[PDB]
Amino acid sequence: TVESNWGGAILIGSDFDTVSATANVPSASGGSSAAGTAWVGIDGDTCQTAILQTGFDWYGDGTYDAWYEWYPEVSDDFITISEGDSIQMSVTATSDTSGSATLENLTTGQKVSKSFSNESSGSLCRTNAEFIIEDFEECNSNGSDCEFVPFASFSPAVEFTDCSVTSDGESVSLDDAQITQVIINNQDVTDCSVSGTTVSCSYV
Amino acid sequence: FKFXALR
Numbered sequence: 001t002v003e004s005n006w007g008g009a010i011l012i013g014s015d016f017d018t019v020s021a022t023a024n025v026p027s028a029s030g031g032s033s034a035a036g037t038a039w040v041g042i043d044g045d046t047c048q049t050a051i052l053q054t055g056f057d058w059y060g061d062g063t064y065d066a067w068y069e070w071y072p073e074v075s076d077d078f079i080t081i082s083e084g085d086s087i088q089m090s091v092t093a094t095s096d097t098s099g100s101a102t103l104e105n106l107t108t109g110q111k112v113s114k115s116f117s118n119e120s121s122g123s124l125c126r127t128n129a130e131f132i133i134e135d136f137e138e139c140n141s142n143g144s145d146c147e148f149v150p151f152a153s154f155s156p157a158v159e160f161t162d163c164s165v166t167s168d169g170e171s172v173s174l175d176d177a178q179i180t181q182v183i184i185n186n187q188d189v190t191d192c193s194v195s196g197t198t199v200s201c202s203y204v
Numbered sequence: 205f206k207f208x209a210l211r
Contacts, residue, residue: 005209006211010211037208044210051210055208071209071210075208136206136208137207138206138207139206
């Protein structure tokens with residue numbers, strides 16, 4: 001029973017412009033069907049109408065993938081990812097219906113980005129900025145059956161370094177971010193903490 | 205499909 005599916009730091013505010021950080025790719029275990037994801041994004045907490053996010057997943061069989069998403073509208077897999085790579089992730093919201101997502105593997109020199117525009121079926125409020133480790137869901141075709149994927153164990157800790165959030169061009173500190181942890185079977189399965197411009201999340 | 209989802 002997954003009681004909390006997000007672990008990480010969430011800032012609440014207004015006019016969030018860009019959210020970016022560099023995260024390391026961990027090794028994962030627990031089975032080919034166990035997984036986890038690390039991503040940076042805008043909205044999706046107190047703003048339930050949309051979320052601009054980009055990041056990567058790890059599966060217990062040692063495989064990975066990268067993606068971007070403007071929920072609920074455009075969602076898709078982006079670059080090659082290997083254990084130990086350093087991935088710079090970033091989203092920018094130029095308006096409630098326009099922005100971009102960029103994922104750069106600083107280790108391989110590969111980079112992908114997607115520009116979004118005229119996003120109708122779901123606009124941003126630009127009131128939440130976040131750095132998250134998540135136990136995501138797997139749904140069938142018609143949303144009639146959605147379930148959380150078994151959460152993979154990972155090592156070392158996934159650290160979002162050089163975190164940067166801006167609101168109206170002004171940079172915002174992580175000082176007052178709310179902290180959440182992934183919780184399964186009434187047990188914390190992450191220990192995410194903030195320190196300076198770093199959000200560090202250890203698997204528990 | 206993968207529902208990477210609201211908090």
